[model samples]
Target: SQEYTLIKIFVSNVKDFYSIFMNSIRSSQSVLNTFFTDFEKGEEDLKNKIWNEDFFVKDKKVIFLGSTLKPETAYGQNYTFINPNEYYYLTLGFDKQNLHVNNIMTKEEIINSCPNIYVCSENSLYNLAYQGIIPLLKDVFILNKIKGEHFVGLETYTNISKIKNLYILPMTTIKMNISTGIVPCVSSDSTDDYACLEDIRKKKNYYCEKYNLKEEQLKNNSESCIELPEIGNNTGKYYYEKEKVSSYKDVKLQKIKEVLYKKQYFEGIMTVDPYKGMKTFNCRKLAKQNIIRNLDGFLYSE
Candidate 1:
């Protein structure tokens, strides 16, 4: 979001950051009063104790050994614990000047890509449109982590964050989307989506493995596109939904006539009688869908 000044923190030690974290944890765990009462109180007490600046050494590690264990059964315990090789889920969020909330791997990505997956400042269609844009961000590397995924939400509670080694950035808080619904997305500053079609197609080979589908052949099937019709250069609102949406819409009627009989790619979009009522549809996703269908037996054997 472009609304507020970003308060980016760079705390190097989790132990030093515990006091601030405890307050947040209390609010989140408040609903679980029964099991977390002691936790909540303990965190409260900890905040004061740690703030003394000399209650204990910052290097000392600890855990919630609980009352179940006697002093004889435990050693080297306190309040902080950490480890590596753990998998955690994470959530990153921000509010732009419109006060619109979004993460887009940081608001920076949207400036380079589309803002569709962005949560609109309002609760209406105009403000909120997820459009599965983040799906395109698969396999992307972000600061403090190798990827921005639904699973990163768990990193906050685990020691993996303490390892001080994220391929992207320092592990801070593993947050979740507090907003009702968020657009699925990541920054495109690092994605190669605008590259050649065959490159994207070959990338589909890798994509197929991640998506559980066989990779489509990327042989540039349309005579290298030298004689293609014009794509509507004026379509801004449709950006990121897919390049083909406006691209196909801008094409000349004659081009459609050429490919119509050989490949019924536009049949769904160019339906019979413009007057026909129809169900709502996703323009861009549907545009990409037509490609696989157009391949027909070209790729699939069944």
Candidate 2:
């Protein structure tokens, strides 16, 4: 009788924990759903609140390599996808030069419209473009697709057995095999965030140095930082005669590898620096804005 009572107590406690956990998850998801739906209306509000109205589209050349190349399309946009590790950069230019749409769409549209990338020079050939993004994302997009949960990140994956002929990403290919011990010195524990944000910052500098970006006329104007909307259906590709990889004990190499393997490795969405920008904006002001935006009782004034 004593043992039976103890078992029943444990079962009851477990049930309560499970119930609370499930409820919390549901509530979190509900909040996220409401946010994106409402934010659909916030694009204009964003323009008014934070963007520069003087921004205009200009004719530009997006070179992916030493030579100026044409986009894939006879007339649309040029999109280039690159594999950093493989040292391969592919530029697909659209024949159709981008037109200035009077009313531009929001962040989501710009991301979706970049035209997908297709990488070459890798064995088995990977197509690292938009078509494959959803394929690898099928589990999240389909059966378990949570409506309006796009705000909170939730892409999941099973082990990738055959990455060949998969139209996989070039950088993604190097990263993927490195992810699953598919390549030399790759270990099981490497699957976490696996890339360092700082390295990206450094790499940005590297590209800038090699590409002569800072010396370019574009950098003279503070306003030259190209906004996403103005990027057009475009791609940039750069080729190096040879990649220079540091030896194992090199400080830069070791530190960069450490950063890449972190589970919390973050590449900000639409920003070079996400957290620093938030802090610079004044935490108090942002909190207030977030509250005002998410307030349930607020009226939609059109």
Candidate 3:
């Protein structure tokens, strides 16, 4: 019924999201403990596949795993996201930091030199990747578990925005079942994303007061940052204001996303990124590969 591309966003840069998850454990251990105790049975499927008897190794940090189809537009990413409504795991990995959340089954995939790591979503075998979660070595990494809210405003390493620093922000529009419960926020071509960014700009008081976001941190001129041909400055703003899209939840914005993708991928021209004058369709794969090649930046999964 649907096709999906899984992308892994390594924990090389952003500590904000990880910190959010980690902070929760330190601050609300009792609350979380109770919640886990009550919800364990409901999430029994996720709690079944144990990669290692010990969840947290000597030194390892949980990384955010996200996915996307528009690998071409990845350069415009300003942040990443996760669904707080769903369940996630910080599966065990090798001592070395270079690991891709591969899609593998059985301990055999993990050899001495090769580190086997995967996040079982809602199945084992291939199903194990989507449906299993081995418990944390008793209590070694009890705090590794977290919901989506922790992922909000987390810094990302993607250069989609052409911005130096990219961090994650929460978006209610994301459907956890769609893509690894993680998403990259590229407001340039997405009206919904623009709406989300605008909302963040508008609600500085709430996010800043409640979430400790700075007025400066929320400032994202990404809409105008990347210049595209036929689409003007920002396709997001072009459609958002043109279509009168007031909220990110507006249904009309979906069609706008589709149209923007059509234009940007084919006829649309990029004035930013290394492939500055090239069309997205032509440079898409090259860009994706380059990002992955450098800095162990990103991983590709079918």
Candidate 4:
């Protein structure tokens, strides 16, 4: 089993997307509209409320959860990535009674019919319930699905990262089934992340036109949060430069990533406070635990 720290990246301003969605539903009759109509009344109560406010679950915020093994490196995250071709579910966390009232499909039916929709994994559901994040429930309620393309340009808030007001950008390489189809881009420590960031800068016009992103949003602003003995501070950028990685698809990146991760895990020291000078091994667990306790994060296993 692989256990990951599921980071809750909250949407800072979903008002724009919410307005577009509401306006689209008013003019058309679509499956999405049907789903929204069932839970339409809830919107009236939530009209004045912002995106982070809970729709059904009390105190739980609306978030796009991203799973990462290296939580210590989260301090370097610059932005969040999503695949524009995919669809993500906005659901009522751990509230099955509401699903019954809304007359939504059963868990099996939802999975079979809407394969792209996001549902909490069975392991996550059990674990979260045990942790008291949610009461034990047999099923989850999916409110509606929004395409990944719609998520682009939307601002988000990170839990541990120093960067604030990050945007959700498109990355075609993201695998939807892996986590939540959302990836936090930590370019300082991650090889793929560095390559992706570099690629965006290199082909600025193409990416900007294709993804409808401003050149400013595509800038690589990742900061180094961990320092290593021989590798220096920015391990990702160091290898990315040393190996001459030209694009995100470079095969040399695989070996560089493995080597970088080992060096960082074993010999790295925290450069960011209040964990400055701490070993990365210890800092990783501390960071994960801190986010889980103080923020909306939780451990998800598959």
* Model 4, runs deviating above 4 Å: 23-28, 31-60, 94-139
Question: Cα lDDT of all candidates, in order?
Answer: 0.22, 0.21, 0.53, 0.65
Using all chains and alpha carbons, the TM-scores for the candidates as numbered come to 0.18, 0.18, 0.68, 0.76
Instruction: After superposing candidate 3 on the true structure, give the runs of residues whose Cα lies further than 4 Å from its correct spot.
Output: 1-7, 10-58, 93-143, 159-164, 223-228, 292-302
* True-structure lDDT of candidate 2: 0.21
Best by lDDT: 4
Window of ten residues with lowest summed lDDT in model 4: 94-103
268, model 4: CA deviation in Å? 1.0
Residue lDDT tens for model 3, 99-218: 224334333233222232333233111222222222222221222455555555555554344564566666777764554556767777667778888887788787667553567777
- Full ranking by lDDT: 4, 3, 1, 2
Tens-digit lDDT track for model 1 on 181-205? 2111111110111122223343665
